Design an enzyme around this catalytic site. Structure first.
Site, PDB file in Angstrom:
ATOM      1  N   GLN A  20       0.831  -1.199   0.000  1.00 55.45           N
ATOM      2  CA  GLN A  20       0.000   0.000   0.000  1.00 55.45           C
ATOM      3  C   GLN A  20       0.887   1.278   0.000  1.00 55.45           C
ATOM      4  O   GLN A  20       0.397   2.395  -0.146  1.00 55.45           O
ATOM      5  CB  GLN A  20      -0.913  -0.007   1.219  1.00 55.45           C
ATOM      6  CG  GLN A  20      -0.166  -0.201   2.516  1.00 55.45           C
ATOM      7  CD  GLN A  20      -1.114  -0.378   3.680  1.00 55.45           C
ATOM      8  OE1 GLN A  20      -1.734  -1.426   3.827  1.00 55.45           O
ATOM      9  NE2 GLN A  20      -1.240   0.654   4.507  1.00 55.45           N
ATOM     10  N   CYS A  26      -4.939   0.026   4.127  1.00 56.21           N
ATOM     11  CA  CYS A  26      -5.041  -1.397   4.383  1.00 56.21           C
ATOM     12  C   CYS A  26      -6.463  -1.905   4.152  1.00 56.21           C
ATOM     13  O   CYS A  26      -6.637  -2.961   3.543  1.00 56.21           O
ATOM     14  CB  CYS A  26      -4.625  -1.709   5.814  1.00 56.21           C
ATOM     15  SG  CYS A  26      -5.629  -0.842   7.059  1.00 56.21           S
ATOM     16  N   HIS A 163      -5.347  -2.136  11.964  1.00 55.01           N
ATOM     17  CA  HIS A 163      -4.831  -2.607  10.693  1.00 55.01           C
ATOM     18  C   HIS A 163      -5.777  -3.651  10.105  1.00 55.01           C
ATOM     19  O   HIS A 163      -6.369  -4.461  10.840  1.00 55.01           O
ATOM     20  CB  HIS A 163      -3.429  -3.208  10.868  1.00 55.01           C
ATOM     21  CG  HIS A 163      -2.732  -3.509   9.572  1.00 55.01           C
ATOM     22  ND1 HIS A 163      -2.717  -2.629   8.509  1.00 55.01           N
ATOM     23  CD2 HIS A 163      -1.961  -4.559   9.198  1.00 55.01           C
ATOM     24  CE1 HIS A 163      -1.966  -3.124   7.535  1.00 55.01           C
ATOM     25  NE2 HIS A 163      -1.497  -4.293   7.929  1.00 55.01           N
ATOM     26  N   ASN A 183      -0.693  -9.839   4.197  1.00 51.75           N
ATOM     27  CA  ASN A 183      -0.610  -8.410   4.509  1.00 51.75           C
ATOM     28  C   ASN A 183      -0.462  -7.628   3.191  1.00 51.75           C
ATOM     29  O   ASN A 183      -0.388  -8.229   2.135  1.00 51.75           O
ATOM     30  CB  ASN A 183       0.600  -8.148   5.414  1.00 51.75           C
ATOM     31  CG  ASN A 183       0.439  -6.895   6.282  1.00 51.75           C
ATOM     32  OD1 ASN A 183      -0.462  -6.067   6.078  1.00 51.75           O
ATOM     33  ND2 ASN A 183       1.325  -6.752   7.256  1.00 51.75           N
TER      34      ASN A 183
END
Length: 216
Positions: A20, A26, A163, A183
């Site tokens: 990102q 996120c 997150h 992630n």
């Protein structure tokens, strides 16, 4: 019965790990990840969807400042579609919501939330649905610098959700139950962009506190 282990990466439901960058988007990456799993399940094609489309257009969210995945799913449903990464590339900063007459790549008919704190229910949604969007406390230095093993830190605050990631499977390694987490901090973070997080350890890091998946 839900299987002991499932890893959607092996079934071709998960696109490559993204970065990102310098934007706190996120929630946008977690959201397109769940949509990519559902698009693959319904159509047979694996394709990169557009996190920038959401960052720029989900007025109810804060762009690079954070947001909720449910809001993003609501937006794709109301807006009748989301573009592909190719039609609406990620730039890592908020811009005007652009309209691409030919960018539409997936639709969404709604979403479902996993009941709060229920890891068993999260396990079943993962086994029956596919990848699921979740939030966690990623504030600890032990999370930020993770590199291998099943992550577990007693200081994780399950009420401090800051997150958004994506659960693409679950399993067990050397006797430790875990969640396979994708992630969006690039391939050089953690283990090739992934982390295994302790499963059935009292909602460690709040993993089952804000989980949801899109309905396609």
């Amino acid at each position: 019965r839900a299987p002991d282990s499932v890893d959607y990466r092996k079934k071709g439901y998960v696109t490559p790990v993204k970065n990102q960058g310098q934007c706190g988007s996120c929630w946008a990456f977690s959201s397109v990840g769940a949509l990519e799993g559902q698009l693959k399940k319904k159509t047979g094609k694996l394709l990169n969807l557009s996190p920038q489309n959401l960052v720029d257009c989900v007025s109810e969210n804060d762009g690079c400042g954070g947001g909720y995945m449910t809001n993003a799913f609501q937006y794709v449903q109301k807006n009748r579609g989301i573009d592909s990464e190719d039609a609406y590339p990620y730039v890592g900063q908020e811009e005007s919501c652009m309209y691409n007459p030919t960018g539409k790549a997936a639709k969404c008919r709604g979403y479902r939330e996993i009941p709060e704190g229920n890891e068993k229910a999260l396990k079943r949604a993962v086994a029956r649905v596919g990848p699921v969007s979740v939030a966690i406390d990623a504030s600890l230095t032990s999370f930020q610098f993770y590199s291998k093993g099943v992550y577990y830190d007693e200081s994780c605050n399950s009420d401090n959700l800051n997150h958004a990631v994506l659960a693409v499977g679950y399993g067990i390694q050397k006797g430790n139950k875990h969640w396979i987490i994708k992630n969006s901090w690039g391939e050089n973070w953690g283990n090739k962009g992934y982390i295994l997080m302790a499963r059935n350890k009292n909602n460690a890091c709040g993993i089952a506190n804000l989980a949801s998946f899109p309905k396609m």
